[PDB]
Design a protein around this ligand. Structure first.
Ligand code: 8VR
Length: 459
């Protein structure tokens, strides 16, 4: 019984990835609904139209989570289910559905942890300029307030945004996410600003509501290490960390943007169109966050741009100052992501040094795999070893006085990986695409049950 009763063992899903029912019960079209049908954007033309069909079998999937001894389920609300056009009339049929999902989790004592925005923007709001238009931030606040009024009697754990770095960075820098834009740095940075503004304003509204649950944001956590002891490389890491960690966590946690990056955007002419009022709202609401969410999969190993010659190479950074690299002496997934428990642990240390005793939830962590199948059984031993290694570093972080209060494995069920199809499995529950999307427990499902039952006595 080592992890305290204070700490939730969970597993996670995202609405676009898991629900399907893209056109049902009054749901508005989203950006991912349109974007996924552009050839070249999703793996093998893979879709969320049906996804894994969680919308129609939510009762079954929740029964399974309960059978797994799950303590908390983290899912996302589809904004286009509540408010189809982003604003305007509320779709009651969408409110019914999330009330039913919430109520079913609750039957079995499973705690909802709810993400409001997991990348699936109602389409008009894309056409307005998405997160580059303050309007979308004001719309988001209204939506959040709608969800709070409708669901907040029962839901006491809320996430505003998920992984802003990806949706903003992939949407405006690489064109791999909607709206599909490439190398527009100013829009990227502007998008992150309006998101952080929407967050802080939403947090202020939630607290004025007097609902007595908790709220915070979920970021990607992607700690950057220097590939060696070389000063140029150390500097490349510092810079990586500034842009990938500090830009995101400082505004939410500290109430100020990191002056290092601010100085460089000014020089480059890329500073966002931000107002004093917006920055005050951010500044005054940094102290209102109850927690920080971490989606952590890997660190990155960096060398400076001109230290090739100075161990395979890496992708260059957006401003071309550094690049990430792969290395002989480390372990990678089959899609090339590093598996680094020591990476994660020092990462956690770096975060307590800067942000102090902030309450941390690991809102995503897991292994993407093409699962071994034997006699119709999914024997996903690699996933078990992945989660095991990460759970052990958490156990140690806690022993070391880090304020970690939950762990949500990425993918409670097999679902759609945005850009990797169904082939990049991440779940505890298998889904049979060849047998009418039927659910089967994997090896990992039974293992995780035991971990929760024992609260992590695994040495
Ligand atoms: C990007 C991908 C993947 O499919 O590879 O990684 C894992 C996980 O990242 C999370 O940060 C996203 O919220 C979620 O949607 C997941 O999907």
């Amino acid at each position: 019984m080592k992890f305290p009763h204070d700490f939730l063992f969970g597993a996670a899903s995202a609405s676009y990835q898991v629900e399907g029912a893209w056109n049902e019960d009054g749901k508005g079209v989203t950006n991912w609904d349109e974007f996924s049908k552009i050839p070249g954007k999703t793996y093998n033309g893979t879709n969320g139209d049906i996804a894994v069909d969680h919308y129609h079998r939510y009762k079954e999937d929740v029964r399974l989570m309960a059978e797994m001894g799950l303590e908390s389920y983290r899912f996302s609300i589809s904004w286009a289910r509540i408010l189809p056009t982003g604003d305007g009339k509320v779709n009651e049929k969408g409110i019914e559905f999330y009330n039913n999902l919430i109520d079913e989790c609750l039957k079995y004592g499973i705690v909802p942890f709810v993400t409001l925005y997991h990348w699936d923007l109602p389409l008009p709001l894309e056409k307005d300029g998405g997160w580059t238009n303050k309007r979308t931030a004001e719309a988001f606040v209204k939506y959040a307030e709608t969800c709070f009024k409708a669901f907040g009697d029962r839901v006491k754990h809320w996430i505003t945004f998920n992984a802003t770095v990806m949706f903003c960075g992939l949407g405006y820098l690489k064109g791999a996410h909607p709206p599909g834009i490439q190398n527009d740095v100013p829009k990227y940075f502007q998008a992150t600003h309006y998101v952080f503004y929407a967050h802080a304003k939403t947090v202020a509204v939630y607290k004025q509501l007097k609902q007595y649950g908790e709220i915070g944001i979920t970021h990607v956590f992607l700690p950057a290490y220097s590939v060696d002891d070389q000063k140029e490389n150390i500097q490349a890491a510092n810079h990586a960390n500034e842009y990938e960690t500090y830009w995101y966590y400082d505004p939410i946690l500290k109430g100020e943007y990191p002056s290092y990056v601010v100085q460089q955007l000014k020089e480059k002419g890329w500073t966002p169109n931000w107002t004093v009022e917006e920055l005050e709202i951010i500044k005054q609401n940094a102290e209102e966050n109850d927690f920080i969410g971490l989606n952590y999969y890997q660190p990155i190993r960096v060398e400076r741009y001109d230290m090739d010659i100075k161990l395979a190479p890496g992708n260059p950074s957006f401003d071309g100052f550094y690049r990430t690299v792969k290395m002989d002496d480390k372990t990678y997934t089959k899609w090339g992501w590093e598996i680094s428990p020591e990476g994660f642990l020092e990462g956690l240390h770096m975060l307590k040094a800067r942000y102090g005793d902030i309450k941390m939830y690991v809102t995503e962590n897991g292994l993407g795999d093409e699962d071994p199948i034997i006699d119709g059984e999914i024997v996903d031993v690699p996933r078990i070893k992945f989660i095991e290694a990460h759970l052990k570093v958490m156990k140690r972080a806690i022993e070391e006085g880090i304020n970690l209060k939950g762990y949500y494995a990425w993918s409670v069920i097999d679902l759609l990986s945005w850009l990797n199809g169904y082939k990049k499995q991440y779940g505890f529950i298998f889904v049979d695409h060849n047998d009418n999307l039927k659910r089967k427990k994997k090896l990992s499902f039974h293992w995780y049950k035991r971990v929760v039952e024992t609260r992590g006595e695994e040495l």
